[PDB]
Design a binder for these strands. Structure first.
Length: 305
DNA sequence: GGTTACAGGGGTTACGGT
């Protein structure tokens, strides 16, 4: 179980006679497009179907996970393509181990993305942990690979590791552009508007890329903290409706799996986009004032009172 | 080398106090 971890945590590894990369590493935003070989498990998949525009290629889309990501993340987005016919992976159920030889990574919308090479191969195993015995179904020949002994071990582990496991919290000083992160914070300020909800929140730790709140402005109802101790969060859709008249100035919140972003004028922000498709599993929820996880915040607050 | 498939998806100036 650990021999798996050990190789993964390197970022790159090898089975049979070819070299893999882990998912987390691979999610690195590479500007230059490179040739990767992947192995993980299908946390989400679409049916193969012909695409309607351009070359109109056959296309299935999948999200490969491994232990270098948290159990919350679906993982790396990969679109597989076939110009030659419908020889794409026939995926039954989640938790199927999937190897993918000869995929490319390419960044888009500030998110690293898999795109398959024309001559891509794959190999696919069942969801061993399922009661159902038919979780693999027969696969199109053209793009298979006869997998060796070692990789079939790997497959049973990944399904096990996944099955058991189905977060990592930061201070606000520790968050950087374009990441998914989780944190406790107290609310300083809110602003509803027609089109969204906004929270200004803090854990009383300075982040370079936060706005510097002046003590010297006139007629501000912000009483503190001053400088770069507060992030703005923007809640869309369901997150708006739940918080708009629920979360209030001075509440202590815990926010899970939010996405960070630099706004137009160059300050780091939090976005919770609407997420109907149960994909990102982000949350924001009130925390009881006397909780032990909140006392590090309270203490820090004395130091800026 | 990266349309198709993505989606989603979007909002003034650190106040305004809606």
């Amino acid at each position: 179980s650990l021999q798996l971890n050990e190789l993964l945590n390197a970022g790159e590894y090898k089975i049979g006679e070819l070299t893999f990369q882990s998912i987390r590493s691979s999610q690195e935003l590479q500007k230059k497009n490179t040739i990767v070989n992947l192995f993980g498990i299908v946390k989400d998949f679409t049916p193969s179907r012909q695409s309607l525009h351009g070359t109109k290629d056959w296309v299935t889309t999948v999200y490969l996970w491994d232990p270098t990501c948290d159990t919350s993340s679906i993982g790396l987005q990969i679109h597989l393509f076939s110009k030659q016919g419908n020889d794409l992976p026939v995926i039954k159920q989640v938790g199927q181990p999937l190897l993918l030889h000869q995929i490319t990574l390419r960044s888009y919308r500030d998110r690293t993305q898999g795109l398959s090479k024309d001559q891509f191969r794959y190999a696919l195993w069942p969801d061993f942990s399922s009661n159902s015995k038919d979780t693999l179904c027969p696969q199109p020949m053209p793009r298979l690979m006869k997998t060796g002994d070692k990789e079939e071990q790997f497959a049973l582990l990944l399904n096990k590791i996944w099955d058991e496991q189905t977060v990592s919290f930061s201070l606000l000083s520790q968050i950087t552009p374009h990441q998914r992160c989780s944190f406790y914070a107290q609310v300083i300020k809110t602003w509803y508007s027609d089109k969204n909800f906004t929270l200004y929140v803090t854990d009383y730790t300075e982040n370079e890329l936060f706005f510097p709140m002046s003590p010297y402005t006139s007629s501000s109802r912000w009483r503190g903290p001053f400088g770069r101790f507060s992030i703005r969060c923007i809640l869309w859709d369901e997150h708006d409706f739940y918080c708009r008249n629920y979360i209030k100035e001075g509440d202590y919140v815990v926010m899970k799996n939010v996405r960070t972003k630099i706004d137009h004028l160059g300050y780091l922000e939090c976005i919770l986009h609407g997420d109907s498709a149960k994909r990102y599993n982000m949350s924001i929820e009130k925390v009881d004032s006397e909780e032990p996880e909140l006392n590090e915040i309270k203490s820090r607050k004395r130091l800026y009172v």
